[PDB]
Paper text:
In this study, we determined the co-crystal structures of drimenol synthase from Aquimarina spongiae (AsDMS), which catalyzes the conversion of farnesyl pyrophosphate (1) into drimenol (2). Crystallographic analyses of the enzyme bound to substrates 1 and drimenyl monophosphate (3) demonstrated that the TCβ domain catalyzes a class II cyclization reaction initiated by protonation, whereas the HAD domain catalyzes a phosphatase-like dephosphorylation reaction dependent on a divalent metal.
Regarding the binding conformation of the pyrophosphate moiety, 1 formed salt bridges with the residues R378, R380, R425, and R513. 1 also formed hydrogen bonds with Y373 and Y426, and interacted with S514 through water-mediated hydrogen bonds. The hydrophobic tail of 1 adopts a binding conformation stabilized by interactions with multiple residues, grouped by their proposed functional roles: catalytic residues (D331, D333, and Y427), residues involved in π–cation interactions (F281, F318, F328, F509, and F518), and residues involved in van der Waals interactions (Y319, A511, and P512).
Residue numbers in the entry:
A (entry chain B): -1 to 0, 19 to 536
B (entry chain A): 19 to 53, 60 to 229, 233 to 536
Amino acid sequence: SHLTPELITSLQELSQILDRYDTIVFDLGDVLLHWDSVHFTSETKGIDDVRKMVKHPVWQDLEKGLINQEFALTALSCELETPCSKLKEMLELSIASLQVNPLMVEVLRVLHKKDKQIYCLSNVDLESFSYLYKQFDFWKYFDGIYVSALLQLRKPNPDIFQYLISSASINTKSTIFIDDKSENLQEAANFGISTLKYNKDNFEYTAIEGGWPIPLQNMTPEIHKKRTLGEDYLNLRLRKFPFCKSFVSNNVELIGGEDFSKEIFSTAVILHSYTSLPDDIIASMCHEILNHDGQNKLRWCFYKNEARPDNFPDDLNTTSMVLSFLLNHNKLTIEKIIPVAEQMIANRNEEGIIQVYFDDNRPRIDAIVAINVLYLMHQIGYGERKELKETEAFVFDFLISKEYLKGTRYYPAPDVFLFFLSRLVVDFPDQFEKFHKPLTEMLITRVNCSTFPLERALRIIALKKLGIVNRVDFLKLLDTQLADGGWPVYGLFIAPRSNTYFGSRELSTAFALEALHILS
Amino acid sequence: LTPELITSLQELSQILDRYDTIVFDLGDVLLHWDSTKGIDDVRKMVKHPVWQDLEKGLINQEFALTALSCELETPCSKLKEMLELSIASLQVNPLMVEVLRVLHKKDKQIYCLSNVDLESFSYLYKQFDFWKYFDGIYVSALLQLRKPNPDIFQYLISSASINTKSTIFIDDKSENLQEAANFGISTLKYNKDNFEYTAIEGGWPQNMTPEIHKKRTLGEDYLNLRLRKFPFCKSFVSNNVELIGGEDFSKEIFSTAVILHSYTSLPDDIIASMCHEILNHDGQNKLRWCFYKNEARPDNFPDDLNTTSMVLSFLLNHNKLTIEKIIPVAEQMIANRNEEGIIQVYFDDNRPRIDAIVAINVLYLMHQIGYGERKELKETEAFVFDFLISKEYLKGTRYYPAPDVFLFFLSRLVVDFPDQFEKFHKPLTEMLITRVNCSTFPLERALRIIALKKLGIVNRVDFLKLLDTQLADGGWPVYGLFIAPRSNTYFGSRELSTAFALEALHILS
Ligand SMILES: CC(C)=CCC/C(C)=C/CC/C(C)=C/COP(=O)(O)OP(=O)(O)O
Ligand SMILES: CC(C)=CCC/C(C)=C/CC/C(C)=C/COP(=O)(O)OP(=O)(O)O
Ligand SMILES: CC(C)=CCC/C(C)=C/CC/C(C)=C/COP(=O)(O)OP(=O)(O)O
Ligand SMILES: CC(C)=CCC/C(C)=C/CC/C(C)=C/COP(=O)(O)OP(=O)(O)O
Ligand SMILES: [Cl-]
Ligand SMILES: [Cl-]
Ligand SMILES: [Cl-]
Ligand SMILES: [Cl-]
Ligand SMILES: [Cl-]
Ligand SMILES: [Cl-]
Ligand SMILES: [Cl-]
Ligand SMILES: [Cl-]
């Protein structure tokens, strides 16, 4: 009574079978990649097959992202009685031998051309995944990447299939799944997904009717309540203070902060980033931007006038973010904006980089202000202007040199730079292709690397816009919502000379809710 | 139902005396109050949902005060001043404390169960002196549970092994006594004019027990396998406490002795086999022990009082040596004092050193063999006491860098010989309370869990996070317990980490 798999040995066969499905799921290993596991070094004592490492239960902890490679290797040098330097060696040689499967990468490229939904489902650890993302170039063929170290789940547990089906909204009826390991294929079949076993010299194809029901939700009821509680919390805050409040102090957690609430920038940030604000709040906060007394001829000052220090200039950051939002909500025309954009091009320093302030007496640069200025440039038609070349290069170097790990002049948190960069790169992809992979690669390395809710939320948002599901940061984010539904205050940006952080519970809650939304 | 209002101290004493276990809260029953910009009423802080987060030990006072500062639209500093005055104006309830003293004196089982935040609890533990009457203290911010959720009552019942039939609960909040009654515990509502006694039929039979059992079995199988293959406990060395890049060393007997002394549920075959390693050890010389095996002994490296102390203490405790054979070595240790009278680390007058934790382990053997009151110990004992009170231990000891290791080994001494160490008990417990969850290393979490339990305090925060760092083979990560300080070499194993983690799981089961 065991279901007899149809064998396949002709590309014509493989092709007709694959065409019968809307959605194809690849696993990386074997199907799309291969490598040499055995690797002898100048260390005679110990194991010789990296397979001993990958078969060890500690490896499950690495794949799920619970531990890193240094940790895994330290525990394995003990369990496997092999000098850890030899295992590190072995693991490196195996990684260096990785190559694509040329046949299946071509299948993958074609499937993507025929406008199919394609997902990558792989047990692979964060550090390896980051390296694979850099080394190969089929990732562009995937509609979504589901990696164990980003999920805290792993094949063959049904949990990972259940999260895949739910996350990607998959109709398992029209879904097939290509993998080498049988137990992964059996698990997916009990979910009603048809399987395609990749063998040495053939494919085993089991069509699966399925159509049975799904089990209990990993945390869905939890999530719906926390989202509602956060929404109620934030809508109440913003309806009472549509001019988004801020607090100041000398630390990122704003411990002991005092209420300031006289800068309009936070309001602009919230208008731009949380895409589910009720309409009355958008309008009420939009009203604030326009009537902001620090508007002078379509240029904005950070401060309200009453709070404006002596001789504090308009800045290209407030102005850029505001104009961009106005433009995008049909409250300003490109014709009115372009003259302001032109003042910005006239604000470059000796190195050609557009500067922060509308004031030649206050020369400053900042990578994120650069980014937000370029965003407005491309949004209005200026994307090919020659005067932007040096500014774009400043931002690219900031990324590639990993200089962003030290923060920007006004934004200390590295993920804030990656986040705003990801809006530019994703929203204007033709003009930013060379950024896409180094950006996605930095983000992969940073999954779950900090505890601050807003930072976790930024990484969730950016990686998802770039096609990668970051469930780990998601989970931890839920754990830090407080009982009233809001998240804790966060110092998004600083007055550098005085080391004054600025932030609000509203800022943290808005990005958190957006991150919960984007993975929903 | 309807309570039976009580106002006779003679009746009350016959109600209470009918019960084997009495649970007190803190508010009103034992502690009460008796006498510009925003919120003048602290009522608003405590009724606010954020306050529940503070009570569960999910956030600390600073976090809570910044969040409330915003939600109550009051300057942070004002909220903090108010919070400090309220706490500072707390006074003992003299009648009820005396009831408590007497219930304790009559050998009842008494537990404290309070919704109080970690920092406040920490203050109250130091301020007031009725804690010595409880058999266990169950504070929400350390349980990550809170009244009146049934969870906490289930935790208390199973944690303390309470027969709810013979258990009565004294609280001033109605809803707490209600939930308590759902578990068959008789309630006694405290009003300032009377008591409301409601008897309840108990005796009829928490919520991670399936998971916890699996992790414990997995960890046991792991450690059992390691020690059966390597009864001479292995060790790795490196520059760092996580022994990243460590190399197999495994030529020192101390780790074996530590395992034996510290993890109580080892199987008999493993205890026997590890005991053989301690007895057949190379470095043994006339019932003094050397850290190293001979094959690894550096030139002129002396026997040391720490390995010797732990080993003799273990053999004694396992009837392999008599006090008569040990006492002459103890006398040698008394002959090892430096100019300040402190007992030194090495059997070698040319390697003069002191180490508060080595002192502790020496003092332990001293009290175990009957030397507890020898005058020559006074300075050593004062060394250790100051080392704690001055907070010098936060800098580590010479050979153990982690502060909690000192607190943990001190807690063996203080709790095993309580009459001789009463003045250590409060400052020790107090320090430990302020260090709950202050570090991530599993072994350090394990030590704080054991020490606090031995001192009558359930630390479940560190417990839960400990369960999360077990690896999938059942063992916990390696950890560097002690160092050669001059080369800054750390020693450690997964056996050490896994042994302590399992004892922590056991002591809270
Ligand atoms: C060379 C090297 C890095 C060795 C260590 C392991 C590793 C990450 C190999 C590269 C390819 C890969 C993703 C294998 C497992 O993933 P899968 O879960 O996609 O494969 P499966 O279905 O074959 O288990
Ligand atoms: C996020 C953002 C709006 C960035 C652009 C600049 C800006 C207006 C920042 C807001 C906060 C602030 C007053 C900074 C100036 O601090 P300083 O006076 O210590 O530094 P400066 O001499 O660099 O102005
Ligand atoms: C100033 C301030 C409010 C500080 C926070 C801690 C606090 C509530 C102190 C007052 C008395 C006390 C220790 C109550 C504990 O709650 P219980 O669980 O002992 O009391 P209940 O049964 O009445 O809740
Ligand atoms: C935990 C314990 C057993 C403590 C007592 C002393 C002892 C034998 C420690 C074991 C580790 C060791 C070899 C230290 C050598 O210290 P060094 O040679 O680096 O410095 P020294 O001059 O302090 O010996
Ligand atoms: Cl790609
Ligand atoms: Cl600058
Ligand atoms: Cl910068
Ligand atoms: Cl574009
Ligand atoms: Cl006390
Ligand atoms: Cl010394
Ligand atoms: Cl010391
Ligand atoms: Cl005693």
